[PDB]
Assembly symmetry: C2
Homo-oligomer: 125 residues x 2
């Protein structure tokens, strides 16, 4: 015909696969999240601002104006699981963490995780 | 149970949606592809190194070691469609461009597009 179009359905999933690898390799990272919560030991997470922005309106606003960002109000382990969700589309936690993850997900407006954690606590009743 | 897991299947697709918006807004971009081909006018494309790396082994190697990259051997219009594929998972072109796009896709080892363009030229016989 006049016009040839093509779509690879697995593409976004494959590309996030490689972006997650680059995050774990600490390649092309432009933000370090320095997480200090209460008496828990300080933890550091290197990430890509554009991936964090693509999964969180709070990160998008934060970065749209190698940066070090100071984060309070969230346990390192919850920030880790939120970052992993942003890079993987998957999150996992012990039943006793679901509340702390929902709290983290509301703070970073990751609405997908808020919904799933809320649906779980309600089912748990 | 002991362990609660969750996966949002549309997540990578939604996140690429927002990364494409940020590319069009020229937000968080860290590379400018300066494309000069023969007598065609010079064109500029701002992008995220990590998105280009996630869709092209050639971009990954290029950026893993605001940068201006000089690109020859490719028409601005083909580089545009390759960038759009990287941000959208979709590419479209007139039947008479399919060869020039395959050429571009081989140069940047976007294997998905090489395969689809090759399958089209062969079907066209």
């Amino acid at each position: 015909n006049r016009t040839f179009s093509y779509t690879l359905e697995d593409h976004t999933k494959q590309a996030f696969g490689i972006m997650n690898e680059l995050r774990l390799s600490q390649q092309l990272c432009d933000v370090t999240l320095q997480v200090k919560y209460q008496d828990a030991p300080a933890a550091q997470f290197m990430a890509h601002k554009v991936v964090l922005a693509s999964s969180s309106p709070v990160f998008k606003a934060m970065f749209t104006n190698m940066e070090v960002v100071s984060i309070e109000g969230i346990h390192p382990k919850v920030m880790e699981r939120l970052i992993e969700f942003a890079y993987t589309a998957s999150i996992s936690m012990g039943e006793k963490c679901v509340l702390h993850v929902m709290n983290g997900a509301v703070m970073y407006q990751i609405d997908s995780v808020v919904r799933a954690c809320a649906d779980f606590l309600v089912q748990q009743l």
